[PDB]
């Protein structure tokens, strides 16, 4: 019944049939993206209309199309031919990955480079990586991937231990031709293996860990209705899944007495970029837009009970489309569970004699994705006290290079001859806000120091100040950890019982933003990553901070274009875009497989409630 | 056997007997502090001499003494008379807190002030607070507490809901004299109650929370020997307890194959200050040194199984002295347990076909203290991967005032007429480092941005810079979140297999430090709180960042005086002092009892190991 229900296998098969009968899905076509469209703004929309957006690639070289389909009515709503030299290429297809290694395997320049290094071509794996936009004019309007080589000594070997440095190739994956092979010199291929399941490397496994058993003998405290609607401890929300963004949270609201109060209309990780900081020409082009170029949802893991998710777990198994329009189920792709989170509130009072302790809990909604060597977990948390938190967990295997004789200012040494280039992992959270409704505003809050003097004779006073962001041209903000800077999203038309506007406060981790030179290609294509906070006026088609077609787009799309409209955001329907990320100087302990590191943000109520919202939590 | 064992009841009784025999503990004497001294530097020199340090107060007004005794040999080692007007008063005694309300109940100035407000003296509670050092010359050399008043409507009422603003009194607790009563005008006493167990306020309790059962069917994975020596998942340490500092960690080490490798010799929270930012003369003197003035270990809670600590819990019950030298057990005052901590490492490799997931866990050592309206939890965490983390949890009831008509720049409104002054909670961690032994140094590490140009033609390169701190005069450092600043403690004489010095990296939360004006009394007394990081050369008598005697002591002691010696810290026995804190602008949701907020820091290995230290963790 809900317009926010997950796509079903039958809906995807119907989309396939509609495209096929319209002549839009011949043997030369590939679906590069397929997703449900959210309902348009309308708090009275009753007519059910399930619409899907599709990007259609053509392997023979014809121009791609963007198509919108109505599943409800069985019709094609619109079909537009795309000029990719202008607006960007379509996302990378899974089937184009293996093409890169196959094409190089018969190219005489590639084979010459391997022969000089005494490498068997059958043992050389090629990582197929997005191309970006640099100095090569012949690439404009063509689908390019670039390849970096790794040696796999045997089928179960970790090829990441054996980078082949000084060599890179560029490939047109539609015309199937190798455009350039660049060989800058011979580097020894690091020889130590990185096989973290080899007993020779692990040593004897520990026998000292005793079981931890986490059970819920009466079942979990949340309910799931209509497939993806969650009710838990006064929270209400819908769990969506999109092949580009992954898990998406809709209609986050809190039941305060008899009122269901909205907080966030839609929450997602709308882009993530991994720029590398090694100036070697072998890698200086390397920037992963994992969301926009690769689509993190289609690489979601199936999560195993007792290993990936521990406790009383409820799974969702979302459905996506393959390249031909067939539905594909990601079995156990989303984990949902509640967990204990320590003490919530505690006080032992001498005067009243009352001793009071209550425990906290959080609801967890998570998925894990694998893109090449990296693995990322995406975690959303809801807490009893109204706090909302996101956490990204980074693990997997670091991307490697040779470690140069004489050292490097831009590469860490992990093992003899083995390097790991410096890089960042930067995320953009898109928060379509709805604090008690859609009339919202953002204030920047700084601590204010005061000078000792009249009215402050002991020099102890301090204060704070709030600045309203009133137009998009002034809503591009930087962090300032030294002044305790936070941002408050409030509703100026909804007051608490003290006659103050209700609000939520965003707490950032204040990690460094994009480090690349402002004039670089990556600073232009990932402009969102250069600032901590952006606020835009809501619009239906402003979905991603990097624009719709990120792959090989020359730059400036997404947030810089949106902000340029300079719309009023003071008490309007607004969207907060928060940049946060990890700056990774790899350490020896990250090798041969990296322990998790984390980054995130949280939002806490700020006068949203009339008092603490967890006074009705029992003692148990 | 171990020199680091907890003080026993018998040792405390023996100290009492030794002091009595020496003529130092007659009926007019009180013990204000008693604690065991750590062994001096010298690997097992003293065979074992258990020594105790005692501060002895005299209720008749004679000068106090600092005494060191050997319980092993039954002797007083030294006894020194203290000149408290010069070097500071002793910590506040529990029995002095009761004196204040009773003395005020008979003072005609106090009664006249209450009669002016139509208040019944029998219902007025007085919060007795430390005095600090301000403009009152008659206080020098005297033990003073200051009192603020709150109305308790009935014996189970939360008096914090009913502050009596505009009124403060100062009391000499030795001569039993009210020195001053200051009345700046009548404020209405806020009338709403704050009784968070009253069903009228809580509403009906939730019935929705289902149980979460955490058990360990085979028992925990750690062992406890010698009363307080812990071994868990390659970690080794001793858990101490001091009445001033609370839980102290000694001899933190990691078993790396065959070798027990030291990391931290002694870790503690060596001071904590809570400065208030309201310039009203009723409260502009208000600063709590909870550790230095009150002694946080003395007020440790007994922790209840299932409420305070959940899971398979091992308890320690430390012994302290009462004011007469009798032993007092804090039953179940320390909780120890291990917790699941999600995914440790994960990778699904396309090329090798191997899927790999491992789970993390952490060892938790915690205690909770209650001082007046505030309750603080202190948590130390050890992780499988070598990470050490500290977390403070702040809860309890916020300190209140009237809310002025016309508002305030320094006070939050919580309820009609009820305010909460702005304040901070600032901690000092004292980390006596021993990274692979005692030859250590500290480097400051900043991210370095690079300009596009020769050798960085695409503008993507970034790097980092490390600066060795070589002398104490240059070892007073501030945070810089924007450049990703961290600090590395390394051993220049101990190298990993890549021939790089082994190290640990300190990651701060980069919260604001002390906000008070630099010329204020509190900035001079809490100078440590004005900077994020200090490094000193180890010395036996340099224990607290505020000095030995904080109560009513002007500046002149502690970290600024230590640093002036300008000692060599480049490859020496060094101590890291890290300042971290919360800046608290109270919100409506903090009333009537505050949900936990947290702050802390962590240390992560940085080339300490030759590869990931958790390759031998089994799959389970
Ligand atoms: Cu990384
Ligand atoms: Cu506070």
Swiss-Prot record, chains A, B:
<feature type="active site" description="Proton acceptor">
    <location>
        <position position="290"/>
    </location>
</feature>
<dbReference type="InterPro" id="IPR000269">
    <property type="entry name" value="Cu_amine_oxidase"/>
</dbReference>
<dbReference type="GO" id="GO:0008131">
    <property type="term" value="F:primary methylamine oxidase activity"/>
</dbReference>
<dbReference type="InterPro" id="IPR054157">
    <property type="entry name" value="AGAO-like_N2"/>
</dbReference>
<keyword id="KW-1015">Disulfide bond</keyword>
<comment type="subunit">
    <text>Homodimer.</text>
</comment>
<comment type="function">
    <text>Catalyzes the oxidative deamination of phenylethylamine to phenylacetaldehyde with the concomitant production of hydrogen peroxide and ammonia.</text>
</comment>
<keyword id="KW-0560">Oxidoreductase</keyword>
<feature type="active site" description="Schiff-base intermediate with substrate; via topaquinone">
    <location>
        <position position="374"/>
    </location>
</feature>
<dbReference type="InterPro" id="IPR049948">
    <property type="entry name" value="Cu_Am_ox_TPQ-bd"/>
</dbReference>
<protein>
    <recommendedName>
        <fullName>Phenylethylamine oxidase</fullName>
        <ecNumber>1.4.3.21</ecNumber>
    </recommendedName>
</protein>
<feature type="binding site">
    <location>
        <position position="425"/>
    </location>
    <ligand>
        <name>Cu cation</name>
    </ligand>
</feature>
<keyword id="KW-0801">TPQ</keyword>
<feature type="disulfide bond">
    <location>
        <begin position="309"/>
        <end position="335"/>
    </location>
</feature>
<feature type="modified residue" description="2',4',5'-topaquinone">
    <location>
        <position position="374"/>
    </location>
</feature>
<feature type="binding site">
    <location>
        <position position="423"/>
    </location>
    <ligand>
        <name>Cu cation</name>
    </ligand>
</feature>
<feature type="binding site">
    <location>
        <begin position="371"/>
        <end position="376"/>
    </location>
    <ligand>
        <name>substrate</name>
    </ligand>
</feature>
<dbReference type="GO" id="GO:0005507">
    <property type="term" value="F:copper ion binding"/>
</dbReference>
<dbReference type="GO" id="GO:0048038">
    <property type="term" value="F:quinone binding"/>
</dbReference>
<dbReference type="InterPro" id="IPR015798">
    <property type="entry name" value="Cu_amine_oxidase_C"/>
</dbReference>
<dbReference type="GO" id="GO:0009308">
    <property type="term" value="P:amine metabolic process"/>
</dbReference>
<feature type="binding site">
    <location>
        <position position="584"/>
    </location>
    <ligand>
        <name>Cu cation</name>
    </ligand>
</feature>
<dbReference type="Pfam" id="PF01179">
    <property type="entry name" value="Cu_amine_oxid"/>
</dbReference>
<dbReference type="InterPro" id="IPR016182">
    <property type="entry name" value="Cu_amine_oxidase_N-reg"/>
</dbReference>
<keyword id="KW-0479">Metal-binding</keyword>
<feature type="binding site">
    <location>
        <begin position="288"/>
        <end position="299"/>
    </location>
    <ligand>
        <name>substrate</name>
    </ligand>
</feature>
<comment type="similarity">
    <text>Belongs to the copper/topaquinone oxidase family.</text>
</comment>
<keyword id="KW-0186">Copper</keyword>
<dbReference type="InterPro" id="IPR036460">
    <property type="entry name" value="Cu_amine_oxidase_C_sf"/>
</dbReference>
<dbReference type="Pfam" id="PF21994">
    <property type="entry name" value="AGAO-like_N2"/>
</dbReference>
<dbReference type="InterPro" id="IPR049947">
    <property type="entry name" value="Cu_Am_Ox_Cu-bd"/>
</dbReference>
């Amino acid at each position: 019944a809900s317009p926010f229900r997950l796509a079903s296998a039958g809906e995807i098969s119907e989309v396939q049939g509609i495209l096929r009968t319209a002549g839009l899905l011949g043997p030369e076509k590939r679906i590069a993206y397929l997703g449900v469209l959210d309902p348009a703004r309308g708090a009275g929309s009753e007519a059910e209309d399930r619409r899907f957006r599709v990007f259609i690639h053509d392997v023979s070289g014809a121009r791609p199309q963007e198509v919108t389909v109505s599943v409800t009515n069985g019709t094609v709503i619109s079909a537009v031919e795309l000029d990719t030299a202008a607006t960007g290429e379509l996302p990378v297809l899974e089937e184009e990955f293996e093409v890169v290694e196959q094409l190089l395997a018969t190219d005489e320049r590639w084979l010459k480079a391997l022969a000089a290094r005494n490498l068997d071509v059958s043992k050389v794996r090629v990582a197929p990586l997005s191309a970006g936009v640099f100095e090569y004019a012949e690439e404009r309007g063509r689908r390019i991937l670039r390849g970096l080589a790794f040696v796999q000594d045997f089928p179960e070997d970790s090829a990441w231990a054996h980078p082949v440095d000084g060599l890179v190739a560029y490939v047109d994956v539609v015309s199937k031709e190798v455009t350039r092979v660049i060989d800058t010199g011979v580097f020894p291929v690091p020889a130590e293996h990185g096989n973290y399941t080899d007993p020779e490397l692990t040593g004897p496994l520990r026998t000292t860990q005793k079981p931890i058993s986490i059970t819920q003998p009466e079942g979990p405290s949340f309910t799931v209705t209509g497939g993806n609607h969650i009710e838990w401890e006064k929270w209400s929300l819908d769990v969506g899944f999109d092949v580009r963004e992954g898990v998406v949270l809709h209609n986050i609201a809190f039941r305060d007495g008899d009122r269901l109060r909205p907080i966030i209309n839609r929450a997602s990780i709308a882009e993530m970029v991994v720029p590398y900081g090694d100036p070697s020409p072998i890698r200086s082009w390397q920037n992963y837009f994992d969301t926009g170029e690769y689509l993190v949802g289609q690489y979601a893991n199936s999560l195993e009970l007792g290993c990936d998710c521990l406790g009383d777990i409820t799974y969702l198994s979302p459905v996506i489309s393959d390249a031909f329009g067939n539905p594909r189920e990601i079995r156990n792709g989303i984990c949902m569970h509640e967990e204990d989170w320590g003490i919530l509130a505690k006080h032992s009072d001498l005067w009243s004699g009352i001793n009071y302790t209550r425990r906290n809990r959080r609801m967890v909604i998570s998925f894990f994705t694998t893109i090449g060597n990296y693995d990322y977990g995406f975690y959303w948390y809801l807490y009893l006290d109204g706090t909302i938190e996101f956490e990204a967990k980074a693990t997997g295997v670091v991307f490697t290079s040779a470690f140069p004789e004489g050292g490097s200012d831009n590469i860490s040494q992990l093992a003899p001859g083995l390097g790991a280039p410096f890089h960042q992992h930067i995320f953009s959270a898109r928060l379509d806000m709805a604090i008690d409704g859609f009339t919202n505003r953002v204030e920047e809050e700084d601590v204010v120091r005061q000078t000792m003097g009249p009215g402050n004779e002991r020099g102890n006073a301090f204060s704070r100040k709030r600045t309203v962001l009133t137009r998009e041209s002034e809503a591009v903000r930087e962090a300032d950890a030294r002044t305790g800077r936070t941002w408050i999203i409030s509703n100026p038309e909804s007051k608490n019982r003290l006659n103050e506007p209700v609000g939520y406060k965003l707490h950032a981790h204040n990690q460094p933003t994009l480090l690349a030179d402002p004039g670089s290609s990556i600073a232009r294509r990932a402009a969102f990553a250069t600032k901590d906070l952006w606020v835009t006026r809501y619009a239906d088609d402003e979905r991603y901070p990097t624009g719709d077609f990120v792959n090989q787009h020359s730059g400036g799309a997404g947030l810089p274009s949106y902000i340029a409209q300079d719309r009023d955001i003071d008490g309007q329907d607004i969207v907060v875009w928060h940049t946060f990320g990890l700056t990774h100087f790899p350490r020896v302990e990250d090798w041969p497989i990296m322990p998790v590191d984390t980054v995130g943000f949280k939002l806490r109520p700020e006068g949203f409630f009339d008092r603490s919202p967890v006074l009705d939590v029992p003692a148990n």
